[PDB]
Ligand binder design. Structure first.
Ligand SMILES: C[As](C)(=O)[O-]
Ligand SMILES: C[As](C)(=O)[O-]
Ligand SMILES: [Ca+2]
Ligand SMILES: [Ca+2]
Lengths: 416, 416
C-alpha cells in the first residue's frame, strides 16, 4: 500500500493506478494524472521522477494534454511507468513522500478536479461481441429461429462509430430529433426520439499502431491494448430502426456516447483474468490463440428519474460475458491492413449475461417495451424519460481491495 | 489572368485556387499552399499579406501543417482569403508580382512537391446518394423489382467510415486479406480478397462545426461546406458481403480510401451549379430547401494494368447525377445533434449516372462479373488485378479555362 491513505472500498488503491486527463480551477490546462485514494497525482509535475530506460528520454509524454503519446510508447514504457509509480507511492519510499514542496504541487483532490476525455480518439469502433445481447436482439426482431445471423459465430462483427460525439462522464445528453417510421403504410415522420436507450459497454484504448497495410497477428495483439474504460452507447432505437438497413447504425448512435475518464491499465486487470468462453465452431486460425484474455469485472447500472429521491439498480452484469475477446477484436480489425492508431477506442458492444438481471439495455430489460422496468418509488420505465440519469459503475474485487472504474454518467435533456 | 502563366487545359487557373498541404526536398515541414498554373504559392510565406478584418488576427492558420484551423474560420475568412489571393496573383497587381525576393521564397514547382493529406480528418462519413448506384446494387443482389430499400428515397443513407486509412493520391493499396464465404455450404475461409474494386466518389470537407446537441438547419448548411476532393473508396466485395449484415460495411472498406490532395473551395465551383434533381416523394421539411447546390463536374476513371502502356478510360460520369445534395447530407448528419468538426470528410457514395458508361464501380461496369470490361490492348477485367493502377480525375469546364482536381490515383499491391 501507499503513503496516501486509501479506504477499503476505494476504486483507486495502489493496485489500480489508472490514467486520466484533468484540470482544476487554478490551472485550467488539461494534464495527465493518476488516481490514488481520493487524490490525483499530477504526472506533469512529477515527470522528472521517471528515470528508467524506457521513459527517461520520453518524459514529455507526461506533459501533454492527452494520453495519446504515452499510449503510443508501448508496453515496456507502460510497465516502467507503473513500476515507477508503485515505488514512488509505496509507504516506505521517501522521494515523493518526503519532498514536501513537490508533494504539495503534485497531489490534488479528485473532488475539486474537472475530468476530460483521456485521449484524442482518431477512430471509434463498436463491436457486438456479447452473445446473449446479440441473441436477445435477434429474438426480438427476427424470432428465436433466426436469433443469430450466419456470420456472428465466425467473426467479431462491428461497425465504425462516430468519434466526435464521444463525451466524458457527466455530460448531459439531449434527446435527439430525427426521422422515424412508426407506421409502415405511411411516409416517415420528423420528431423527437421516442425510444431512447442506454447500452452498457466497456472499451479499450489502442497503444502503438500498426503500419497501414500490415496486420497485427493475434499473438502480438496483447502488446497493443493499453487499458479500459466504461461506456454508455446512447441509442435512439426508433431512429436506428428506420435508417440502418443496409449500411448500419448511424444517427441512432451518433448523438452521444459517454465514457468514464479513468483509464485502467491492462496490467491492473490481469489478476482478474478468467478463461475465454469456448467457441464453437472454432474460429479460423488468424483468430485462434490460447492466451486467457477474458476479465471478471463487475458492472452495475442505475437509473434515477427527476423527482425520485434514490437511484434504482436496473442491471447487474459482468464483462466476462463477451464471446469474442479483445485480442480477437483487435486482430480482426487489422487483418485487412487497417491501421489502428494510439488512442483509438474499440468497444465491446452491449454487455448482457444470460440472467435477465444482467441484460445491458432497456430494450432487453423491458423486452421491446412489453415489460415495465421497476425503478422504485412506484415508478416504472420501458425506455428513458427526459430528466432520467443513468450511471454505470464497475470494479474488480480483490481480497481487501478493488480495482474500480469510477463512473460513467449522463442525464437526458429534453429534445430541442 | 494571373502573372503566373496558365495553360488553357490546366486544372489550376486563377479561377480555381485550391488549398493543399505539401513539402519539398528542401523543407520537410508540411505547409499550406495554393495551386496556380504548374506552381504552388506557399501561404506561410505570404501570410502577412492577409491584412483584412477576417484574417488579420488569424494569420497563424496559414502556418499550420493542416488546413483544419483555416477550415474552422468560416465563410467570411474563406472569402477574404480568396479575394486576397485573386488580387495578389493578378497579372495587373504589383505587390507579389514585382517582389522578386518574395516570389523566390513564395513559389515552388508542383513537380518538386510532395502532397500530404490536406486535413486531420476527425470523422469520415460515406453517403450512398447516387440513385442509379443503389438501384444497380439492389438489382444485382435482390432482383429487379426490389431495386431500392424502403428508406432510400426518404433520407440520405450513409455510414461512418474509417478515418485512419484515408490516404493521399499515389499511395499504394495492398490487396487485403480477410474472411470470406465463397459459398454457403462450407464454413468461411481466410485468404486474399478475390473481388477487389474501386468506387468513384467526391467528398467535401466541413468548415466551422456545430455545437454538440445543436443541429445545423438546412438554410445554414452551405456555411459549413469548405470545398471538395476526389475519392476512391477501395472495396473488397467478398469480404464486405460476408461481414456487413447487420452493422454495415467494415473491413470491406477500411483497408484504404484514397483522396486527391487539392481542396477546391466551394466558391470556385459555384459558377457550375445546376438545379437539384427533382425528389419524389418530397422529403420532410428539415431536408427541404430551394437553393441550387448540384454541380456540373465531369468525372473520369482510368485503369492501367502493369503490362499496359496506355490507361483505358472505364468510366465517364458527373457529380450532377447525385440525388441527395451536400446540403441535405450535412443537414441530415447533424439533425440528431451530432457535432460535425472542421476537417471532417463527407463523401458522396459511388457516383453512377443512368448511362452504363457512367457506372462508378467495376461491380457495376462488369455487372457482377458477368460482363468483361474492355481495358484495351487485348486485355479485359471484371475486378482489379495486382499491379492495376486506377486514376480518378475531374473538372468543371468554363469558357477558356477549367476548374480541375488533379489526380486521385492508386496502384494495387499483391496480398501478403
Ligand atoms: C447494434 As444494437 C442491436 O446493440 O443498437
Ligand atoms: C455500400 As457499396 C454496395 O457502394 O459497397
Ligand atoms: Ca453499441
Ligand atoms: Ca463507398
Amino acid at each position: 500500500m501507499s503513503f496516501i491513505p486509501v479506504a477499503e472500498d476505494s476504486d483507486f488503491p495502489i493496485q489500480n493506478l489508472p490514467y486520466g486527463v484533468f484540470s482544476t480551477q487554478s490551472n485550467p490546462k488539461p494534464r495527465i494524472g493518476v488516481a490514488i485514494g481520493d487524490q490525483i497525482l499530477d504526472l506533469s509535475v512529477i515527470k522528472h521522477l521517471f528515470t528508467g530506460p524506457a521513459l527517461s528520454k520520453h518524459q514529455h509524454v507526461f506533459d501533454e494534454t492527452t494520453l495519446n503519446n504515452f499510449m503510443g510508447l508501448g508496453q515496456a514504457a507502460w510497465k516502467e511507468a507503473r513500476a515507477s509509480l508503485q515505488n514512488l507511492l509505496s509507504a516506505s519510499q521517501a522521494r515523493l513522500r518526503d519532498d514536501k514542496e513537490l508533494r504539495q504541487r503534485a497531489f490534488t483532490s479528485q473532488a475539486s478536479a474537472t475530468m476530460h476525455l483521456p485521449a484524442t480518439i482518431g477512430d471509434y469502433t463498436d463491436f457486438y461481441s456479447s452473445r446473449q445481447h446479440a441473441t436477445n436482439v435477434g429474438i426480438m426482431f427476427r424470432g428465436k429461429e433466426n436469433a443469430l445471423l450466419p456470420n456472428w459465430l465466425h467473426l467479431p462483427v462491428g461497425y465504425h462509430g462516430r468519434a466526435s460525439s464521444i463525451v466524458v462522464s457527466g455530460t448531459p445528453i439531449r434527446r435527439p430529433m430525427g426521422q422515424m417510421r412508426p407506421d409502415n403504410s405511411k411516409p416517415p415522420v420528423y420528431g423527437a426520439c421516442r425510444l431512447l436507450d442506454m447500452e452498457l459497454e466497456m472499451a479499450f484504448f489502442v497503444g502503438p499502431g500498426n503500419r497501414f497495410g500490415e496486420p497485427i497477428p493475434i499473438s502480438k495483439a496483447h502488446e497493443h491494448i493499453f487499458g479500459m474504460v466504461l461506456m454508455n452507447d446512447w441509442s435512439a432505437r426508433d431512429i436506428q430502426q428506420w435508417e440502418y438497413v443496409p449500411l448500419g447504425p448511424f444517427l441512432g448512435k451518433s448523438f452521444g456516447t459517454t465514457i468514464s475518464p479513468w483509464v485502467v491499465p491492462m496490467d491492473a486487470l490481469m489478476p482478474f483474468v478468467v478463461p475465454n468462453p469456448k467457441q464453437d465452431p472454432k474460429p479460423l486460425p488468424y483468430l485462434c490463440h490460447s492466451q486467457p484474455y477474458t476479465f471478471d469485472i463487475n458492472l452495475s447500472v442505475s437509473l434515477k428519474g427527476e423527482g425520485m429521491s434514490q437511484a434504482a439498480t436496473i442491471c447487474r452484469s459482468n464483462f466476462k460475458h463477451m464471446y469474442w475477446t479483445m485480442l480477437q477484436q483487435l486482430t480482426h480489425h487489422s487483418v485487412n491492413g487497417c491501421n489502428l492508431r494510439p488512442g483509438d477506442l474499440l468497444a465491446s458492444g452491449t454487455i448482457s449475461g444470460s440472467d435477465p438481471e444482467s441484460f445491458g439495455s432497456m430494450l432487453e430489460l423491458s423486452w421491446k417495451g412489453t415489460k415495465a422496468i421497476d425503478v422504485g418509488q412506484g415508478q416504472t420505465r420501458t425506455f428513458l424519460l427526459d430528466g432520467d440519469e443513468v450511471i454505470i459503475t464497475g470494479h474488480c474485487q480483490g481480497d481487501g481491495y478493488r480495482v474500480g472504474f469510477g463512473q460513467c454518467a449522463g442525464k437526458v435533456l429534453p429534445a430541442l
